[PDB]
């Protein structure tokens, strides 16, 4: 009917621990640090990013730029049409990763702390590498309903399935912009698996590490993908009374299908 002409939307970039992609202290000189910072509620240019049509991400005329093409170098703010033309190129995948195309190295927040400088690290699809461009800052607070129409309920350090209650403590989850799934009681805790192995009962640990085992993606087929190891959320032997939520290869049975009910 036409060509899907695309816009350049001004946006903030929320990532690890809900902290925005921010230009440090507002100064825009070539080489200043792109840091992590609490998401401002105003029109300060040092947090507002135009997703330009040429796969470049600009805040106030200057480009989100990697210093180099090696794991470890930091991401700075630089004059677009002065620096290397592909040190400013980025893509934003549907799974959350924002990636430079020269080397697969991905925008990451190596620490979950404020004032932390952004870098580019080798892509392990981790919590410290998941990003989401939005102007909505707060995470997504919903309930997660799975097999047999029962709820996902984090108790203290255990995730299990228990029939849904309108306000029970606690089955209300916050889907963060870094791919983590956090019980709203303690926002410092993530849906975490200790591997990178198959069965691996999923637990609830602190998001401090921001590891590849705490980042997830709600896929189109109703599964919740680990984004690493290619494993989804599985109810072990389809038995809720076991209180065992596990990782397992995608098979598509009701023990792997989920729907977020807000």
């Amino acid at each position, epitope marked *: 009917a036409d060509v899907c002409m695309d816009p350049e939307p001004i946006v903030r970039i929320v990532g690890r621990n809900g902290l925005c992609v921010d230009v440090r202290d507002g100064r825009f000189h070539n080489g200043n640090a792109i840091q992590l910072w609490p998401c401002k509620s105003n029109t300060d240019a040092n947090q507002l990013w135009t997703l330009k049509r040429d796969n470049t991400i600009r805040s106030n005329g200057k480009c989100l730029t*990697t210093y*180099g*093409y*090696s794991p*470890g170098v930091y991401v700075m703010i630089y004059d677009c049409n002065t620096a*290397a*033309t592909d040190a400013t190129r980025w893509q934003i995948w549907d799974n959350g990763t924002i990636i430079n195309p020269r080397s697969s190295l991905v925008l990451a927040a190596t620490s979950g702390n404020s004032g932390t400088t952004l870098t580019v690290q*080798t892509n392990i699809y981790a919590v410290s590498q998941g990003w989401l461009p939005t102007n909505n800052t707060q995470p997504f607070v919903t309930t997660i309903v799975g097999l047999y129409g029962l709820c996902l309920q984090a108790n203290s350090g255990q995730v299990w399935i228990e029939d849904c209650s309108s306000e029970k403590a606690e089955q209300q989850w916050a889907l963060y912009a870094d791919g983590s799934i956090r019980p709203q009681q303690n926002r410092d805790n993530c849906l975490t698996s200790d591997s990178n192995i198959r069965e691996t009962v999923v637990k609830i640990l602190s998001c401090g590490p921001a590891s590849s085992g705490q980042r997830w993606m709600f896929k189109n087929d109703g599964t919740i993908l680990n984004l690493y190891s290619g494993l989804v959320l599985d109810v072990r032997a389809s038995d809720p009374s076991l209180k065992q939520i596990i990782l397992y290869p995608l098979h598509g049975d009701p023990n792997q299908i989920w729907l977020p009910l807000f």
Partner: antibody
Amino acid sequence: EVQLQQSGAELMNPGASVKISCKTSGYTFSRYWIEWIIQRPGHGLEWIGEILPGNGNTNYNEKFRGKATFTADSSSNTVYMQLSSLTSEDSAVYYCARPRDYGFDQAWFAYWGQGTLVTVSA
Amino acid sequence: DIVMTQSPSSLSASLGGKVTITCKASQDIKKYIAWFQHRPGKGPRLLIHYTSTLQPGIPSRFSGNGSGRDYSFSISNLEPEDIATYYCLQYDNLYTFGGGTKLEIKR
């Protein structure tokens, strides 16, 4: 800084594969890219591709997409390129080089290797 | 996707005379270009690493500059050791060489 060294000359049967090596030393091996440049008579120089050791990422010239295959062994601090289905057009001197630093105003070519001659002949 | 057509294909020059080689990119390389001297029987050698900045140990008679897509390269006080093939390399989009220029000298 120090050095890169490659393998000696090679003769292959037309239609086979040969794996040139590039032994790196004197710098932190994992954090720097390794480049590859062909030089056949009259053709001057042409950029083949690059491989980053330590994380196995690659970037290929499209003319060598399918001809080249870069590999890096983290144990012995080396980098290998392999040319498949060698015709007589693949008979050339193959160089390996490095950038000077992490880029991007650095990461121009420095620290070349002495080159390796591949001769494809029956 | 960044082609670089170099000029001229080759040239001869009298001893001591200035020479000029030019490279032109399909798009802007943003002053990211180097010049290389391929002495016969020797490996490549870098002379100018940023568009004008000279590599150490290169004589003051080697010069180069440019803006955007057009680039120059000039050896001024030519000498019998300057016989080589010279190439232009950009490192903005990726590494792309020119066709090279072969320098011959007279006696």
